[PDB]
Design a binder for this molecule. Sequence first.
Ligand SMILES: Nc1ncnc2c1ncn2[C@@H]1O[C@H](COP(=O)(O)OP(=O)(O)OC[C@H]2O[C@@H](O)[C@H](O)[C@@H]2O)[C@@H](O)[C@H]1OP(=O)(O)O
Ligand SMILES: *[C@@H]1O[C@H](CO)[C@@H](O[C@@H]2O[C@H](CO)[C@@H](O)[C@H](O)[C@H]2NC(C)=O)[C@H](O)[C@H]1NC(C)=O
Ligand SMILES: [Ca+2]
Length: 941
Amino acid sequence: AYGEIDFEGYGGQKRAPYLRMSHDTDANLVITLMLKRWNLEIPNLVISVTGGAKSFVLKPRLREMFRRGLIKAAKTTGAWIITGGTNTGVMKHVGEAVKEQQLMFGSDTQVNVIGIATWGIVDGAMLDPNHSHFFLVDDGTEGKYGVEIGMRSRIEEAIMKVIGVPVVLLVLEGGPNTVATMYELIKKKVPAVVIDGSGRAASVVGFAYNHTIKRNVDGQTINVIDPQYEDEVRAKVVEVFGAKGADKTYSMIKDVLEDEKMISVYSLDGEISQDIDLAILKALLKANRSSPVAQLNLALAWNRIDLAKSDIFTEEQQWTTETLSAAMLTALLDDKAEFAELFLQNGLSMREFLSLDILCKLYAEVPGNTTIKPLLQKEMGKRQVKTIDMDVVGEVIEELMGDMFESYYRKDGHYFPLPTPYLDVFLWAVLCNRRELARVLWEAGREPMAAALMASRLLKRMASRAQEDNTITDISSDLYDHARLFEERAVGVLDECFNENETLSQTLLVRELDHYSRMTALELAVSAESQDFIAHTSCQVLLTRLWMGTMAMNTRWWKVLVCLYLPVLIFPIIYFVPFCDRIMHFYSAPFSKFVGNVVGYLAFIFLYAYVVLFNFPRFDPAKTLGGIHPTEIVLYFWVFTILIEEIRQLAAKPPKYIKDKVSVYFSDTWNFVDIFSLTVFIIAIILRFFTNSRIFTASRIILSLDIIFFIVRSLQIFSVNRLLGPKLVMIQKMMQDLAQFIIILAVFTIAYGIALHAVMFPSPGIYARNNTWVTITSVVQYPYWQMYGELFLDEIQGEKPKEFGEVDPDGRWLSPLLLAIYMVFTNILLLNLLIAIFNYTFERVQEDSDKVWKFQRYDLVQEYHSRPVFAPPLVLLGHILIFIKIGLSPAEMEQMDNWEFQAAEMYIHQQQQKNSGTLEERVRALGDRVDCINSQLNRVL
Ligand SMILES: Nc1ncnc2c1ncn2[C@@H]1O[C@H](COP(=O)(O)OP(=O)(O)OC[C@H]2O[C@@H](O)[C@H](O)[C@@H]2O)[C@@H](O)[C@H]1OP(=O)(O)O
Ligand SMILES: *[C@@H]1O[C@H](CO)[C@@H](O[C@@H]2O[C@H](CO)[C@@H](O)[C@H](O)[C@H]2NC(C)=O)[C@H](O)[C@H]1NC(C)=O
Ligand SMILES: [Ca+2]
């Protein structure tokens, strides 16, 4: 009789196979049956739980601690649990522990709970319906119990033969057959863990283990009972469990304790909050029979880093890449960053470990609560490929870096050993939003501040992506915190690089970073909008040397101006940091180009203002030159110069394709202001010539309103000043706030204006404004000007009937009431709310204004570094004369990488010294010292 029980509605769809057996059966047949016929996976652990069956008395805090610890030890490992097939005792509570942790839980949570029972008691006692497999071993009549014992010992012997699998024994609250199975498993060299202080037979063993420890023999130095307490343990074994025939179980409970490495005692009141899995791990590392990798992946499954450093990673047992590779895969995939660090620092290298298939697998088993799984799955949806590879990962990284980034998985043939294994496992750890794993993989790999700036860009752009998308879980606060963490890591590396040899810091911030799509550390810092990095002293003296191009870093603007239009007075009073060489080095400076742009642009604004304010006549073919004044021709020349300047800025973008040049060109809004003002000027000067009244009227109005947009373009000039620049950043963010609040202002303005114009001017009547346009513009207009305190009191109360209108007489008293309500709601309440929003914006910018000026100083340097090295009024002639990021040696790049890595090492060491020097870590280490003093005093006493 062999088959599969379907328990009648006792919890669980999955049925449980059973097998009638005998004790004559060798256990190799049983293990090949339960590994081939029943298809159980070979476990990393076999727990054998043993205790009482009928007379089972259990404590509630002990039963909850035991079942929580045993489920935590079995599910995190994937362990077999071997008990009896009995619906009562410790078997019932192990079965209920397995039952209550799987119903409405994860799908791949199935603990194979094997019940080895006797066929002579099933329907003695009923089989437990929460067990998974059943071994029903018998040889004779009913009531027999000893046929379970030997077969249960031999099956676990054969599990250790396939030692291979670390079988452990838990003993708690048992009786005579509990210590019988316990002794037969000790004979099979199964390490036992006894729960002392729990019950009637697991206390006695505890009361015979540490209370009566003694070594008084040769022959591997066994442990025996004390002669002082032999009377007490004999009274306890004859009274507590067992009435008659307790001599054989007393001899048995003595011969259990013969070997010190196979018995271990873990009580409840001794170590309360400590889980039973470390007790199992100490028993397995104490028996000294398991593989190093079996002990290793049990410590991985139980997150036991301290015992792994203590006894698994001893100096006498060395490690290799292939003997740590599966453990490293488990530590990476399950977010075990201290195990990952330990594996990297003992015997493992990412160059030998990480391959292409391991990395694609590493991006395959991302958990799902991260942003990177919806990003990769959306790229698979755009790709129509069922599997993951590095082309998908590289394209996710390209759209998640932005700014024409080119990921090296798309390019390099190794991604279709690896070139940079630390970098791409680091980028994996960053994309998975893993704090300590990305910290460990950042500390381990080269090019550290570029890696940290790229990580900050990835994390805050995933933060923007998860904030802007509803199909991605908003973990944006954790992502911005992680990005800020990598920002301060990059700043600290740059600070340690700047503390010695600032010249190497400047030559390190402008390098050829080939694994970052050939962009520098400054460009990785300004793409990531890392303001604390750009505000560092190294980046600012770099921007000041770039801003003063081969010219002394403190020459004032007036010397540049008087030597800018006088190239003969340039020789005495401009000093250089080392015919025409001094000329081209002076005009090459972006500060010279800046001062020339300021002066020529003030000249342009004055000429534009003379044209729009004083002389912009109509076009007529009667007089010469169409009547166009030659100041307007000089204005056409200089706006054509602005046009050719913006065409040169478009053509001089680092991409090669035209659409990518347009994408890089319209990244800043100043190019939007440029293209808008140029297009509106070209429309105005096309409409200039059509000699119609309305067309020329539109031409001059469009021109006289486009001077506003040229002056709006002139504010990047003001961004040169430390005071004025952040004020313009404030103006920009306040215009964003005003664009957000203008809908609420428009709703209350139009709501008041409709009622106001309805009560003043009722439309089917004699007080009606018989013009739809003056009605609509009154509804828009009069609340808006009344909002600024321009009360139309004499107008809206019926007086001034000429220029306002005949107000309805019943609307002459209701109009001040509506006006008063609108004034207290809009001038007082809404406008001061808008000013409060403006002040909140002011405080947010002013608390960071120094760093935001340092950041926009980069864009100021970039917009003048590319300008033509020519005259400030003749810069179109400079474009005519044109039309007609450093690279180091490979030895220099290697030395610069070594220097950057060593300064990162000093930074990481200083962070460890700050971490170990805090009050909490000092108190923690002092408590560990007090625990060592207590252990030493226990060894003395
Ligand atoms: N495996 C069993 N399943 C169900 N009942 C058992 C079992 N073994 C004995 N008993 C009974 O319970 C009474 C006392 O129960 P305990 O002493 O607490 O059970 P014990 O600790 O000796 O053995 C339990 C078995 O379950 C596992 O802990 C381990 O494999 C071990 O062989 C006995 O007079 C015996 O008397 P009775 O069958 O109820 O007339
Ligand atoms: C707007 O048009 C209406 C419609 O004709 C004018 O209402 C008339 O006004 C005259 C005297 O003002 C009355 O004798 C008529 O009886 C009115 N007709 C209706 C249908 O009410 C109104 O005067 C016009 N208002 C303006 C400002 O032009
Ligand atoms: Ca521009």
